[PDB]
Design a binder for this molecule. Sequence first.
Ligand SMILES: N=C(N)NCCCCN(CCCN)C[C@H]1O[C@@H](n2cnc3c(N)ncnc32)[C@H](O)[C@@H]1O
Ligand SMILES: N=C(N)NCCCCN(CCCN)C[C@H]1O[C@@H](n2cnc3c(N)ncnc32)[C@H](O)[C@@H]1O
Lengths: 342, 342
Amino acid sequence: SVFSERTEESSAVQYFQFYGYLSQQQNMMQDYVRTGTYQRAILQNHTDFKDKIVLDVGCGSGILSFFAAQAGARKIYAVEASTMAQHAEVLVKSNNLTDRIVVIPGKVEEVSLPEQVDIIISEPMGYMLFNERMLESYLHAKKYLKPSGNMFPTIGDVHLAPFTDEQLYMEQFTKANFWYQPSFHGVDLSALRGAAVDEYFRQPVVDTFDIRILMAKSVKYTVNFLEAKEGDLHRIEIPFKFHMLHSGLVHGLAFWFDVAFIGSIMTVWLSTAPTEPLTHWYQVRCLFQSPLFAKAGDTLSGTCLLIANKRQSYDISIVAQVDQTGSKSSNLLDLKNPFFRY
Amino acid sequence: SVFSERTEESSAVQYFQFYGYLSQQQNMMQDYVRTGTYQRAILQNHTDFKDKIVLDVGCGSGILSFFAAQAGARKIYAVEASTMAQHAEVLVKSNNLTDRIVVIPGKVEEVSLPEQVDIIISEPMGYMLFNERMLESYLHAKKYLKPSGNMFPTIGDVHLAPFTDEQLYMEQFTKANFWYQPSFHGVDLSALRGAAVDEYFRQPVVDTFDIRILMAKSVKYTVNFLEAKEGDLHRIEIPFKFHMLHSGLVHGLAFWFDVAFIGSIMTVWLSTAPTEPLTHWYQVRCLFQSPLFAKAGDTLSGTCLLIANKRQSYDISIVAQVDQTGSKSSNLLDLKNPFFRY
Ligand SMILES: N=C(N)NCCCCN(CCCN)C[C@H]1O[C@@H](n2cnc3c(N)ncnc32)[C@H](O)[C@@H]1O
Ligand SMILES: N=C(N)NCCCCN(CCCN)C[C@H]1O[C@@H](n2cnc3c(N)ncnc32)[C@H](O)[C@@H]1O
């Protein structure tokens, strides 16, 4: 399929085994901001569901399907690829909704649906929006969408901003410096220090932070899911140009995202910004191996380039330069192996 | 090979990607008990290394090979299957030991050694000794061992003992009762409560604990690595008959292990017992889903059966009965997906 061609089999097994656990389902459902915002987006746009056909892409436990049912959908096809499908079917029976929710086991790239749908709903966002590459399956499912059909969420904004955090930089550098030791039980490890720093700094840091550390207005990159094709997400180029508001060492870039549910009645936002209440996505920070010194008024420019890989993630390349001084930094991150610092 | 026949490819790639990170190697090297005990066993038995040929099975960073070099080995073949082999080669060059340490990339079941060896060294122990099934590779490598050659470690003892921990047992139903909720955002989850309890009890708990919880002298199961064949580890039957020293509810069984390095000069032990200082292996506990009441002086009897699976672990079946009352309990656990509670 379109799914097995872009996905190493090893990565798919680990991925669907992880989402087959009820404990993981629980962890996600207990995020009140996530769950409540989805429910609000769906129930406040009830006209977009009432007597319509809906597709739920990666239904999980089946919670979004239940919300579409609460809003008055005629029928909901809830497609799910893990063994979680069997547990969803149990819930559909015990909440007396077999007349309205049909669980279809399989990947959305491989199953067959009896009709076209009026609207597609999903929670495809990962860390930094793009991790897990579930946006591709969400976009692929537009093949079942009637003309003039809607998608929930409808748009996604990735936000990035430069940050200063000496203590985070020093935690990571200190761990790597284990490999400086000229005589670890009589053995010199120091020839691996370079490799060790690379490995530590390749890992993005997932946790929250005070907005006081951000040193510029954020830059926005927008994906419109109604218009995007699957292929737009194999290579994502995000140019940026920050105007620094504070002088200091810039230790890397912080990422967060917003999605919007653009209904007929109203638009609802789900934000993972650090100014907003916390979600289980936190925020994500990509440290530079060497910090860059920038004076207030200076311009920090460059590119964030995400290239999709077969382990359902992205290789991230960030190249940044201070324009006034020509101080440059280049960094490669591996979004599959993040560091959960919370 | 003998390795790809017993191992799902998906599990092997996750396994060797995990051991290819320097950070994981560092985490194991920073365990002073582990590293120090290996060094002590090797240097204090210098006669078993001086001018001998040695094979290091799963060398990692190569630290055991460097210890065999410190002890006077003529030649050391260090076999390593992850991308860590390339980092080991760098260390061998930068510590000027290319004349004495030869790194061989690949699995020990598939590579070729030029000669037979006097002694084999490895750290094959996982959680509960047997997890990761690396003992099979260690035993397989006896094909390169000269007659009357030694192995380090030489013997392994698994210890089991019944324990009481009401708070651990209760935490499982607390987590599961998230599902016993008739209207979670308008949805009744309660029908999944049973499945959630089952899922929590299939997971062994990895962490440490006060010895005050143990309710009987432990029982020992011994593997002699000089005599054992690969096939002895596919199915491991551990009968037990505990004489209870304390009355109370028995909530499950605790496991830990000891290995011995039996050299010519002295025997050195590496213990992960809860009476001993903590190691990165902690201890492991398998809850019974129904706890058993035992009076001091009563006999708790039964079987612990470990059955090897193709995900490089074991399915664990525990059946226990109190002989005086006829109260029975069984559990099935999946040692691949443990719960890290520490
Ligand atoms: N903490 C984080 N990262 N939170 C954000 C991630 C949460 C994503 N979650 C959706 C939950 C719905 N509310 C994923 C679920 O979608 C299923 N799924 C994945 N890919 C699929 C495919 N190609 N076809 C059909 N189903 C597919 C998967 O099995 C799993 O059940
Ligand atoms: N709690 C924990 N960590 N418990 C487990 C202790 C882990 C010990 N570690 C050795 C490094 C320290 N001496 C494992 C290493 O053995 C390598 N390896 C495994 N199987 C291999 C095979 N069939 N052929 C060749 N190499 C093989 C693996 O790649 C990895 O480097």
